[PDB]
Amino acid sequence: QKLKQDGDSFRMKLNTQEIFDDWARKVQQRNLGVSGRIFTIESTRVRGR
């Protein structure tokens, strides 16, 4: 019983990959421009100097 009480939450925070979920949320937002950045082969603008 003590092992279950101290192991359910242990396996919960132990089996967690929320970083990929955050990346997936950002993908849901603008994936066609962020993940699929295959439109231009090189940029064309100025820099800072």
Partner: peptide, 13 residues
């Protein structure tokens, strides 16, 4: 440099 940026972003504003 500046000339390269102008030759590249001329059509890309």
């Amino acid at each position: 440099v500046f000339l390269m940026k102008q030759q590249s972003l001329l059509a890309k504003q």
